[PDB]
Design a protein around this ligand. Sequence first.
Ligand SMILES: CCCCCCCCCCCCCCCCCC(=O)OC[C@H](COP(=O)([O-])OCC[N+](C)(C)C)OC(=O)CCCCCCCCCCCCCCCCC
Ligand SMILES: CCCCCCCCCCCCCCCCCC(=O)OC[C@H](COP(=O)([O-])OCC[N+](C)(C)C)OC(=O)CCCCCCCCCCCCCCCCC
Ligand SMILES: CCCCCCCCCCCCCCCCCC(=O)OC[C@H](COP(=O)([O-])OCC[N+](C)(C)C)OC(=O)CCCCCCCCCCCCCCCCC
Ligand SMILES: CCCCCCCCCCCCCCCCCC(=O)OC[C@H](COP(=O)([O-])OCC[N+](C)(C)C)OC(=O)CCCCCCCCCCCCCCCCC
Lengths: 382, 382
Amino acid sequence: APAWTTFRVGLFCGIFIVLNITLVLAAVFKLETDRSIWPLIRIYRGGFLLIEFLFLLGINTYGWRQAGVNHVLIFELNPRSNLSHQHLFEIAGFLGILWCLSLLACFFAPISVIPTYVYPLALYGFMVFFLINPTKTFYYKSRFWLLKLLFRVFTAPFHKVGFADFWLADQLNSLSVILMDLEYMICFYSLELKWDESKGLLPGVRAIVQCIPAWLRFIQCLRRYRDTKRAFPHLVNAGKYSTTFFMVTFAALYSTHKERGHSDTMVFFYLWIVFYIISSCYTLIWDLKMDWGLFDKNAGENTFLREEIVYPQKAYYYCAIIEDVILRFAWTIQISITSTTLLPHSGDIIATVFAPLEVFRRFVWNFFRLENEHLNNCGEFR
Amino acid sequence: APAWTTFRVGLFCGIFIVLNITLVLAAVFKLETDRSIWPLIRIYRGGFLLIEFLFLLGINTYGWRQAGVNHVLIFELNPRSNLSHQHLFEIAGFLGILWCLSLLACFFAPISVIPTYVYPLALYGFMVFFLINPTKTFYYKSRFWLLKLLFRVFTAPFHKVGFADFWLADQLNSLSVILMDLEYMICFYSLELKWDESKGLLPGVRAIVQCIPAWLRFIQCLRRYRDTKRAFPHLVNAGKYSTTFFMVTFAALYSTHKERGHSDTMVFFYLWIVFYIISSCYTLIWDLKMDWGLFDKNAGENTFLREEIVYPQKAYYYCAIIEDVILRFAWTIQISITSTTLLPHSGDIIATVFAPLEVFRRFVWNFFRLENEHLNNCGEFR
Ligand SMILES: CCCCCCCCCCCCCCCCCC(=O)OC[C@H](COP(=O)([O-])OCC[N+](C)(C)C)OC(=O)CCCCCCCCCCCCCCCCC
Ligand SMILES: CCCCCCCCCCCCCCCCCC(=O)OC[C@H](COP(=O)([O-])OCC[N+](C)(C)C)OC(=O)CCCCCCCCCCCCCCCCC
Ligand SMILES: CCCCCCCCCCCCCCCCCC(=O)OC[C@H](COP(=O)([O-])OCC[N+](C)(C)C)OC(=O)CCCCCCCCCCCCCCCCC
Ligand SMILES: CCCCCCCCCCCCCCCCCC(=O)OC[C@H](COP(=O)([O-])OCC[N+](C)(C)C)OC(=O)CCCCCCCCCCCCCCCCC
């Protein structure tokens, strides 16, 4: 990669570090004292997750470059002009600079007129303008490819399902915090926000929104079967996402009938518990045995894993498996707490702590799924 | 292709940028009108100009390797272990981060311990600690080379004379102000300071030390004459540097008699004026005729330049010449004002603005003097 790309990577990383430190210092000592900044958090976290996601994705590319598995051919990208890890770090650093500047603007509102509202709006609007921009400024091929994929994924099962479409729809299942907080921003600006004089911060459908990343995968797998006529792995995956469907549904039912009479709420709680267990076990075993391709009985050495090991040492696998076993339950409880008022106490703190763990599990799952899709060719994309 | 080194260069550049922005924003946010920044800036500009010179020298090395300058053959040096512009950039950025941290700590003073006046010394000590430390690291070879040339430069003709020591001594003329800064530090830390308060302030020897960079070159020219028994240009150069002695002498006399109010005050003024004029024109013609080797007869299509320009555009040279014809005068004016007490009003801003301009003039002067030396060997170093 050219030296100027690395220079911009370093510049953006250093600005990111300094802005992180000054955000910590500003948020710990003198920001508002008594503000209850929690709504602000919900506005920013998902966007931050995106930055984090991109950052993590860059590392993944590095691995997929150092392992050099198939990344050019699996995603069916162009054989030339493919983004490297440094380019992902560049974009992530630019977005992090914008995010930190918006956060500092929120904490230092006297920076300009039109306080508060515009800054998160400005950040996300700038991220959208960078995304959809036919001016062909910088990496226009990448942004256009992402735009084309989003239509093929976020819309419906009408489109053909490919590896890239499946991958994006799948990792939306882990960064769906942004989808939740987008509707949260809409509602908060609509109703919760004072939005009358200045600096106003006061010192049902969400269940549907939570299932959109699950609905997309369910209908994608249904389309896969409809054009496949051979549901060896497909209906299993549909059941896997229907477990999330049921867990979200009964979480919503419990949070609705807890405070509205209906003393049979203990039945809903037991159903929630059993569906939590079922979804966690289903997703975990699907990841371990058939998604990552581990636990292969044909393997002779390096038990609990498969015959062929791309990565340098088996130590990366067992720690990852333990962390994934923890983070599967983390995600399972997260997508239930963020959906509705399951836990009146805390919850938001839990959601903010747990979301980066979901993106972390995505970061390792990308490694393992991509390195699995070189020999087994799961999903038969070929 | 030092990719990680380029990354570190960018990281340090970004941290320095954000720290400088924080400095400029805290200067107009914190501090009080009755607490003038003049002591703090008179302490810190010594390191500020050092960092500026180091970064400009990195640019100088980059430009030298860009087109036609070989600052290895005639620079002493080793043709296999030279410092590149990346390394100079990294060193400048590292010292800039340390300087910015020191200045910010002096601005805020988060803790009642480690008084404000302790922060600069450590940095300067750290600067010394980057050279005197014998641990073979941090480009130990270059640090040892610098400390082995700071002896051949800062001493008397007891040593020999070459290109490297002559150049290092010449840079001292542009860096004379920081020497005064060091002097000021001592005068700050010996005579006027309230050691019982953590705040940094309260709401003829200098004229001699000012000539030290001039003496180190005058006596070195005399050494060259004693060696080669060559009248021109060694004695001409000696006169050019003794013009500094004459200028400072008459400026000091005029200022001293101005405050003392004696009848011989006005007589020295015209002598100071004429010596200023002759000194400025002397250094000017030395720069534009023998330093840079311009105004050459039968040079060719080049206007006012010599036969060989090497550098891409002719316009550069003309700009340089114009800037030189300005900056030298400012430079000479600076020598008048910083040292002697003449016209205490203003001057401080004059010094703090013209000193970086002096370093910029030295930057261009390094750009062209080494070119002249490479093209037509001057100072008889062949
Ligand atoms: C070291 C002590 C202090 C540590 C402080 C930080 C610790 C906290 C944990 C950070 C983990 C960082 C891991 C990723 C970086 C290394 C990845 C890698 O493979 O690099 C090798 C890569 C590639 O290595 P390479 O180029 O040597 O490999 C090929 C070289 N040849 C061809 C010659 C063989 O390194 C680079 O040169 C790339 C650019 C620099 C490394 C990227 C750093 C970016 C840091 C961004 C941070 C902030 C932005 C986003 C943050 C968002 C989250 C909030
Ligand atoms: C409305 C809600 C929207 C929610 C989702 C928002 C977008 C989420 C995107 C997640 C994945 C992003 C990276 C995927 C591709 C990277 C992996 C890879 O190696 O592929 C190479 C690809 C292609 O790069 P390439 O250089 O290899 O190109 C290949 C060459 N062609 C195209 C000819 C085949 O890399 C990318 O596309 C990455 C660059 C784009 C990164 C995103 C830009 C900024 C993100 C802002 C998103 C908007 C947030 C919305 C906020 C609220 C809106 C109201
Ligand atoms: C007592 C008064 C002290 C006054 C000190 C004035 C400043 C001295 C340091 C600045 C001059 C150095 C740059 C000029 C030479 C560059 C030549 C070149 O291109 O080669 C690169 C040279 C060597 O290049 P190289 O290593 O690539 O070449 C190979 C060399 N040999 C032959 C040995 C293999 O390296 C440097 O100049 C960089 C070294 C770091 C310099 C800065 C260190 C930290 C700053 C502290 C300075 C002191 C501050 C004092 C403040 C007050 C203290 C009380
Ligand atoms: C944004 C505002 C710009 C103007 C503000 C005024 C300051 C000047 C800003 C920099 C102007 C250009 C300088 C570098 C010119 C190009 C050099 C080069 O080759 O770069 C390529 C290098 C990388 O090397 P490279 O190997 O890519 O070299 C390019 C040539 N090839 C590829 C063919 C070999 O890029 C950099 O890393 C440049 C660093 C940024 C510029 C300098 C800042 C860092 C060092 C100083 C830190 C701050 C302390 C001192 C600041 C001043 C006093 C307070």
